[PDB]
């Protein structure tokens, strides 16, 4: 049930702003950072929404005007699509799958250019969609530098230390239009996902749902993304998608969602909710040290087999046929 | 067409002594050891029957009486079965497949005991079958030692040298009853198979027929053997067995068949042909050094993946399910 905004400002959102899917879900717990149960969840690599970390407190005032005015003149990656779906793809892997045609295109532009583009679409009633996704770096301006330094490093550094994580590799700034969707995928880093402006519905699946989510081949550009079109699921190709069960929540300004490494996540900016802003915090996982093996360890194993085969056969397109030859009439 | 025995002693065998199978075959070339084409075949790891190596010339006089009298008092492995099929199995792998029930049993006995056993079966018209398969070692007697030293080491040592093979690991003595069959399998060593007494029909398949022959899982006791029952092929489980094509020949006293490493072979002692005697020569293959990869190199790869998975998962029975999880809806 949608939370009530302080000062009797009404429900933050309603059901009609959520897209409709074929699978059930249960809620991700929303807890205080001081609550021992929250610590227990993170320790165990289970998702939790923390409501009071103040992780990005200084960024809560961010909006397009403030950012355009202060974020500097560095380049920003902006994806353009004609669909609500922004399927991530790795450009370096495109040569090995000549037949892959991306539904979204990347363009590098200045921030003010991104804003202007957003403005032209609105005014002309265009259907085009943009999604800015850019790692925060040294070209940001002084005020942004001041804001960034004001993030709650004390709290997050302790988390990093307590969990034995590796280094912070980056902070991705995400600015999306209402209705934008990042289709289901998993990342190989730990993530504290800090919501800043607007609302995002986040649907997560544990690593043990690998069999229901059908990730692309490792060498395909959409490595780590699910092949299933959540809007039109092909049960003939992906029969176990009928058994998938998610954990969901809607995060708003001030909320931080722990997205544990290897956990699948599908993220959508609420329909008619305006633009969204998020900053994530990606950390390398702890080192690999006991049976039974965890789901995520089996995932790691499968990825490695795929990678080794690709290298040994000298052509990633030969991976499938060898794998098939290995199992038919033998293990299946 | 069956060869004619010298001195007008008639055909060495006839068609009716061969079992009937579902697949076609072509003949393996029979050539002189001095013929350059023979050398070309061996060099290329293709089978050839050599008719005049004199490799085991001194063993041509061997028969049960001579061997009982001279082969010493060491133990001999003798397999007993109630079927003509002597499917090889690795006893060390039996613990991991508790449900595997061998159709043949191994018994260690003295040579004279093997002979006596053969005698009792004949006299009592029993249906039991025996197959002696024993590595030649230090307990053999002086006359056998004299015979063994009289093998054509000059010729075979040159082969070993020319092909870059590793060491001779052993010589297996095989003494079988008429009608005995060693079901299709491949070995990871190079083999010169030297026929001594009686006739054996040998059906070989190249390594690129892996997909048609369905070897057991690597951790199963029947690793390297085909799961297909050549006498009653299950096309539902093994559909590509319908595409198998063999190379065949019948070897007799004096013949040597080069069975190249990784080549499948099915070997049968001719029906109503009396006992057979063979001595093989197993050599480790050359060292692994270029694309495209050979069929046998892909086989090596598949074996290694199976082995690594077994070790990493800590339980070989988990190999199949992981492999299936890897490919369904992803590579198949």
């Amino acid at each position: 049930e949608p939370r009530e905004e302080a000062g009797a400002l009404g429900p933050a959102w309603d059901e009609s702003q959520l897209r409709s899917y074929s699978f059930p879900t249960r809620p991700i717990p929303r807890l205080s950072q001081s609550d021992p149960r929250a610590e227990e969840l993170i320790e165990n690599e289970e998702p939790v929404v923390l409501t009071d970390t103040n992780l990005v407190y200084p960024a809560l005032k961010w909006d397009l005007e403030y950012l355009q005015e202060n974020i500097g003149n560095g380049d920003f990656s902006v994806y353009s699509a004609s669909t609500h779906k922004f399927l991530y793809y790795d450009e370096k892997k495109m040569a090995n799958f000549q037949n892959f045609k991306p539904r979204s295109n990347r363009e590098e532009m200045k921030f003010h250019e991104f804003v202007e583009k957003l403005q032209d679409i609105q005014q002309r009633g265009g259907e085009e969609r943009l999604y800015l996704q850019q790692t925060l770096n040294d070209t940001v301006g002084r005020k942004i530098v001041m804001d960034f330094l004001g993030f709650n490093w004390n709290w997050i550094n302790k988390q990093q230390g307590k969990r034995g994580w590796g280094q912070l590799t980056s902070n991705l700034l995400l600015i999306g239009m209402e209705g934008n969707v990042t289709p289901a995928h998993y990342d190989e880093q730990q993530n504290f996902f800090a919501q800043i402006k607007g609302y995002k519905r986040c649907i997560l699946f544990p690593p043990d749902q690998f069999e229901c989510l059908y990730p692309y081949p490792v060498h395909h550009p959409c490595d780590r993304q699910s092949q299933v079109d959540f809007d039109n699921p092909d049960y003939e190709r992906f029969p176990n998608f009928q058994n998938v069960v998610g954990y969901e929540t809607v995060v708003g300004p001030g909320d931080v969602l722990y997205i544990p490494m290897y956990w699948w996540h599908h993220i959508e900016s609420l329909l008619n909710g305006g633009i969204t802003i998020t900053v994530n915090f990606w950390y390398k996982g702890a080192p690999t040290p006991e049976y039974p093996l965890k789901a995520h360890q089996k995932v790691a194993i499968m990825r490695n087999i795929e990678k080794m085969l690709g290298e040994a056969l000298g052509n990633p397109q030969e991976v499938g046929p060898l794998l098939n030859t290995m199992i038919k009439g033998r293990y299946n | 067409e069956p060869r004619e025995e010298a001195g007008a002693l008639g055909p060495a065998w006839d068609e009716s002594q061969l079992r009937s199978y579902s697949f076609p075959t072509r003949p393996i070339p029979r050539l002189s050891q001095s013929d350059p084409r023979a050398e070309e075949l061996i060099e290329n790891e293709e089978p050839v029957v050599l008719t005049d190596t004199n490799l085991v010339y001194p063993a041509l006089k061997w028969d049960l009486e001579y061997l009982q009298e001279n082969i010493g008092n060491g133990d001999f492995s003798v397999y007993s079965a109630s079927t003509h099929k002597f499917l090889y199995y690795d006893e060390k792998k039996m613990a991991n497949f508790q449900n595997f029930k061998p159709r043949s049993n191994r018994e260690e006995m003295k040579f004279h005991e093997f002979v006596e056993k053969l005698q009792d079966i004949q006299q009592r018209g029993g249906e039991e079958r025996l197959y002696l398969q024993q590595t030649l070692n230090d307990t053999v007697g002086r006359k056998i030692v004299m015979d063994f030293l009289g093998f054509n080491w000059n010729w075979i040592n040159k082969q070993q040298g020319k092909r870059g093979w590793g060491q001779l690991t052993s010589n297996l003595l095989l003494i079988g009853m008429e009608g005995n069959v060693t079901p299709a399998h491949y070995d990871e060593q190079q083999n010169f198979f030297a026929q001594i007494k009686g006739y054996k029909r040998c059906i070989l398949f190249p390594p690129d027929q892996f997909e048609c022959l369905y070897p057991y899982p690597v951790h199963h006791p029947c690793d390297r053997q085909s799961q297909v029952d050549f006498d009653n092929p299950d096309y539902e489980r093994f559909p590509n067995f319908q595409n198998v094509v063999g190379y065949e020949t019948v070897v007799g006293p004096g013949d040597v068949l080069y069975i190249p490493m990784y080549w499948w072979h099915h070997i049968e002692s001719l029906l109503n042909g009396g006992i057979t005697i063979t001595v093989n020569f197993w050599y480790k293959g050359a060292p692994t050094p270029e694309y495209p990869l050979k069929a046998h190199q892909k086989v090596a790869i598949m074996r290694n993946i199976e082995k690594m998975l077994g070790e990493a998962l800590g339980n070989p029975q988990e190999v199949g399910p992981l492999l299936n999880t890897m490919i369904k809806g992803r590579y198949n």
């Binding site: 770096n137 040294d138 990042t182 990606w282 690999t288 | 998975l309």
Partner: peptide
Amino acid sequence: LTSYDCEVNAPILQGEELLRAL
């Protein structure tokens, strides 16, 4: 075999490096 890389939906100063420099 159990070892893992660090790939995410983004290309490879930033992160820890950005913070310290600042």
